[PDB]
Design a protein around this ligand. Structure first.
Ligand SMILES: *[C@@H]1O[C@H](CO)[C@@H](O[C@@H]2O[C@H](CO)[C@@H](O[C@@H]3O[C@H](CO)[C@@H](O)[C@H](O)[C@@H]3O)[C@H](O)[C@H]2NC(C)=O)[C@H](O)[C@H]1NC(C)=O
Ligand SMILES: *[C@@H]1O[C@H](CO)[C@@H](O)[C@H](O)[C@H]1NC(C)=O
Ligand SMILES: *[C@@H]1O[C@H](CO)[C@@H](O)[C@H](O)[C@H]1NC(C)=O
Ligand SMILES: *[C@@H]1O[C@H](CO)[C@@H](O)[C@H](O)[C@H]1NC(C)=O
Lengths: 219, 220, 172
């Protein structure tokens, strides 16, 4: 049984700075024919895995030469000399010598650092066709910001809310390497009908002061 | 050119059965070795099994995690690769990938989602995120549609049948209190194009077979 | 000097290659009979000077020589046979649509060669680090006299009938 151990990520690599990932196997990958069957895969978010470097150091067609391959026996290294916003993803390493079975590594997720970008804030009232179903959902949107750390607070008729909000965030984009956030305040139609002012206060490092986007029910 | 497309995923009760199909086109199929690999939600990659050609008498090999329960087939006359999985378990909930491993080429399919659970399927409800009368921004405007109350998770959203991709955010789904998932997809578009252009989100829930296209418009 | 493969090649290549050659050798004569029977007169009678193994630019193969040498020559043959059968199958579908058995036994022979192509080209790459080979192709039969289109395809399956027995005899 072969295992593939990878050194995890230590910090988000700043744009343009080099990066080093390494796989370390339990047993030697040098086969009898003389070849070392060690690959490197990359999985951009939403995409299936694709092959970057095969047989230690040989690149795949359509892969920039920034990527480098090296290693011998049980130790290998993946080298990127400059980091651009397309390299964000998970990297695996696969062996094919003692096969079957074929084995992968756990994966080294790569993150990128960039300039501080302030988010764009929007807010949507609940759908009038949704109030017929009984529930009212207010959505606040944060578009393209860095760093990922953003604070969202809801104020209904100037009253800080809690318990009835759910939020998710997007992975780092493959072009500008920024994140996007989505909050959702959810109330029943009767409780939503008992107020008027619905707000959304966003606090971010790139914002000199908390920015508010609000609407009034029925406007 | 070369294409691999799987099909057969959906919702299947534990201890059940399922038969996936992977149709290929672009290379010599009667000679290629075909593999299946799955990726569990928030997990890594796990090889499942391979199959060979007629020279090797269609010899199959399986990982011990699935041996005795999964069966790999291939129809060389149709260039189709199969995976008949019986006695399914909740661990098998993963995205199953079709791949061709060869010295000539390395190619992975798009993957299909197999979800193993005992809960019933529910189709989602799509509501338009219509911006209010206060378009506080200039030029840049945001609109979208929210998906609500569905299970399983693999839900697809495409805007204008694919003709709209730049500036689209399809957020990761949240888990609600009732065990249902919620998801909203938004897009940023020029405000001047609001009256001129018409934006439509296309929600497709394969397990429930719920295809819904909702047109987002400013209200009143 | 430089060759690399993503994943390893098939086990027992020389057994697969020889099993591929021996399989082609068996179906060689059946494809010869199927062809000239579909062409009609004057081929099934003057089968000697119209359908013989006289093909001019056909690549060579010497039974002597190293395994690398015998395999690079085999690579040029299988490439030559691929472009010809693809042309001949195009030529025959316009001339003879009635014989759907000749079409299905021409598609079979075409696919066995392409499976043999990976076995031969990898073994060069994985063992001798060949990487790539410069080859030659046959003449195009797109616009030619119908009889020459029939005759050229006849002599090819005759030379192929005789050359495939040589290849199946060697190797091992
Ligand atoms: C019928 O036969 C002719 C020739 O016998 C075939 O044409 C040949 O097709 C091959 C395959 O694409 C061509 O090869 C290529 O060569 C170029 C350089 O010219 C190279 O850049 C490519 O990577 C590839 O190796 C070849 O040039 C071409 N020769 C001629 C004279 O056209 C034709 O394809 C056959 N028809 C059918 C339906 O198979
Ligand atoms: C073709 O080759 C055979 C022997 O290989 C020979 O007897 C015959 O004369 C040749 N045909 C021509 C036209 O030279
Ligand atoms: C014959 O083989 C070719 C190989 O490219 C294939 O595309 C074609 O479908 C085959 N013809 C059939 C199956 O009738
Ligand atoms: C090829 O097939 C013929 C029968 O058509 C047979 O006589 C011959 O021995 C075969 N060649 C080899 C090398 O086995």
């Amino acid at each position: 049984d072969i295992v593939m151990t990878q050194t995890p990520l230590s910090s988000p690599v700043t744009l343009g700075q080099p990066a080093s990932i390494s796989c370390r196997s339990s047993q030697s990958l040098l086969d009898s024919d003389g070849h070392t069957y060690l690959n490197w895969l990359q999985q951009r978010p939403g995409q299936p895995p694709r092959l970057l470097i095969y047989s230690v150091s040989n690149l795949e067609s359509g892969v920039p030469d920034r990527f480098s391959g090296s290693g011998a026996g049980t130790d290998f290294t993946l080298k990127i000399s400059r980091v651009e916003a397309e390299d964000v993803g998970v990297y695996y390493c696969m062996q094919a010598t003692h096969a079957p079975p074929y084995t992968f590594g756990q994966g080294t997720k790569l993150e990128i650092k960039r300039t501080v970008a302030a988010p764009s804030v929007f807010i949507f009232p609940p759908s009038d066709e949704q109030l017929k179903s009984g529930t009212a959902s207010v959505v606040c949107l944060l578009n393209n910001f860095y760093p990922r750390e953003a604070k969202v607070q809801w104020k209904v008729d100037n009253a800080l809310q809690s318990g009835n909000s759910q939020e998710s965030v997007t992975e780092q984009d493959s072009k500008d390497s920024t994140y996007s956030l989505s909050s959702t305040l959810t109330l029943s139609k009767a409780d939503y009908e008992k107020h008027k002012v619905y707000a959304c206060e966003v606090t971010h490092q790139g914002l000199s002061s908390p920015v508010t986007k609000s609407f009034n029910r029925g406007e | 050119q070369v294409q691999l497309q799987e099909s057969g995923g959906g919702l299947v009760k534990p201890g059940g059965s399922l038969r996936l199909s992977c149709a290929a086109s672009g290379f010599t199929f009667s000679h290629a070795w075909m593999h299946w690999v799955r990726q569990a939600p928030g997990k890594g990659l796990e090889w499942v099994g391979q199959i060979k050609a007629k020279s090797d008498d269609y010899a199959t090999y399986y990982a011990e995690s699935v041996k005795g329960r999964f069966t790999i087939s291939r129809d060389d006359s149709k260039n189709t690769l199969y995976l008949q999985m019986n006695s399914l378990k909740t661990e098998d909930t993963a995205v199953y990938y079709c791949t061709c491993w060869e010295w000539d080429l390395d190619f992975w399919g798009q993957g299909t989602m197999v979800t193993v659970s005992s809960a019933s399927t529910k189709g989602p409800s799509v509501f338009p995120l219509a911006p209010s009368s206060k378009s506080t921004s200039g030029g840049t405007a945001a609109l979208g549609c929210l998906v609500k109350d569905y299970f399983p998770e693999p839900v697809t959203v495409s805007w204008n049948s694919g003709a709209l991709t730049s500036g689209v955010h399809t957020f990761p789904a949240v888990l609600q209190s009732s065990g249902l998932y919620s998801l909203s997809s938004v897009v940023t578009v020029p405000s001047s194009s609001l009256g001129t252009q018409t934006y439509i989100c296309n929600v497709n829930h394969k397990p429930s077979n719920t295809k819904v296209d909702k047109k987002v418009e400013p209200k009143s | 000097a430089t060759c690399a493969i993503r994943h390893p090649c098939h086990n027992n290549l020389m057994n697969q290659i020889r099993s591929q050659l021996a399989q082609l050798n068996g179906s060689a004569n059946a494809l010869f009979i199927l062809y000239y029977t579909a062409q009609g007169e004057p081929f099934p009678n003057n089968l000697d000077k119209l359908c013989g193994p006289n093909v001019t630019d056909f690549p060579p193969f010497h039974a002597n020589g190293t395994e690398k040498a015998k395999l690079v020559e085999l690579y040029r043959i299988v490439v030559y046979l691929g472009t010809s059968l693809g042309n001949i199958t195009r030529d025959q579908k316009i001339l003879n649509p009635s014989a759907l058995s000749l079409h299905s036994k021409l598609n079979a022979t075409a696919d066995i060669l392409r499976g043999l192509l990976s076995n031969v080209l990898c073994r060069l790459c994985s063992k001798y680090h060949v990487g790539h080979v410069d080859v030659t192709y046959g003449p195009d039969t797109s616009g030619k006299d119908v009889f020459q289109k029939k005759k050229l395809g006849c002599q090819l399956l005759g030379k192929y009938k005789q050359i495939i027995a040589v290849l199946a005899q060697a190797f091992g």
